[PDB]
Amino acid sequence: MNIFEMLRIDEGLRLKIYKDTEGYYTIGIGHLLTKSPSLNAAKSELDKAIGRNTNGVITKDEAECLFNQDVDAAVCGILRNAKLKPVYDSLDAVRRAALINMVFQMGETGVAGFTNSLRMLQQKRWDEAAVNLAKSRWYNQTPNRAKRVITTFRTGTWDAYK
Ligand SMILES: *SC1=NC(C)(C)N(O)C1(C)C
Ligand SMILES: *SC1=NC(C)(C)N(O)C1(C)C
Ligand SMILES: [Cl-]
Ligand SMILES: [Cl-]
Ligand SMILES: [K+]
């Protein structure tokens, strides 16, 4: 297991534009295209991301391309954020993956907003952090995925993905 395999499990793989759990146009391995309700807007975002006139459909290799860029972007977002970087630096590799996962799903700004959870993570108070993380719109809206990510923070293992 690693961050790529973890997010591949959580996000799935679909080669045609679809709507994610929030109702937003997405493709590939959880690549958010736009929050706009316009399918044409989503298709334009797709063409720009891939660099060709698509039909709203991409190849698996293209999905993996976007995925690698997106994982990189999540790590970058963490490292450039004054709230997230110290926590990331403080974590072991498995828990780092959990934090990357959250940023991939909700974005840098959203995760940086979890101030009290972040503090508990930096304090290595894992059970307490797990309880606090579940008290969230995030957990309520995607409870199975959030449970896997939270278990990863709680235990420092990949047990939730094996
Ligand atoms: S990244 C990227 N996407 C495709 C599949 C077009 N590629 O060949 C690259 C350059 C690896
Ligand atoms: S950090 C970072 N790298 C890219 C260019 C992918 N970004 O958009 C961020 C999130 C600002
Ligand atoms: Cl430490
Ligand atoms: Cl709490
Ligand atoms: K998805």
CATH number of the 1-162 domain: 1.10.530.40
> Any idea where the domains of the chain sit in the sequence?
1-162
Secondary structure in 3-state letters for 11-75: HCCEEEEEECCCCCEEEECCEEEECCCCHHHHHHHHHHHHCCCCCCECCHHHHHHHHHHHHHHHH
Residue in the block written with tokens 């060709």: 52
Residue type, 93: A
Pocket of ligand 2 (CB under 6 A): 73, 76-77, 80
Closest CA to 70 of 10, 136, 135, 114: 10
Residue of 31, 61, 67 to test ligand 1 pocket, by largest number of atoms within 8 Å of CB? 61
Is 114 part of any known ligand binding site?
no
Is residue 126 within 8 A of residue 155, CB to CB? The reply is yes
- Ligand found nearest the CA of 134: 4
Is residue 73 within 8 A of residue 108, CB to CB? The reply is no
Please list, in sequence order, all residues whose beta carbon lies within 8 angstroms of the beta carbon of residue 98, skipping any fewer than 6 positions away. Answer: 149, 152, 153
Closest CA to 16 of 47, 59, 49, 65: 59
Burial of residue 8 (CB within 10 Å: 0-12, 13-18, 19+) is: middle
Backbone conformation region of residue 156, classed left if phi is above 0, alpha if psi is from -120 to 50, else beta: left
Nearest CA to ligand 2 atom 6: 73
Residue of 31, 52, 65 to test ligand 1 pocket, by largest number of atoms within 8 Å of CB? 65
Q: How was this structure determined?
A: X-ray
Data resolution in angstroms = 1.5
Is 132 part of any known ligand binding site?
yes
Beta-carbon count within 10 A of 1 CB: 15
Is 44 part of any known ligand binding site?
no
- Ligand found nearest the CA of 105: 5
Q: What is the spatial distance between Cα 99 and Cα 10, in angstroms, rounded to a whole number?
A: 14
Q: Which residues are catalytic?
A: 11, 20
For the four alpha carbons of 73, 26, 13 and 63, in that order, the dihedral sign comes to negative
Ligand 1 binding pocket includes 65 (Cβ within 6 Å): yes
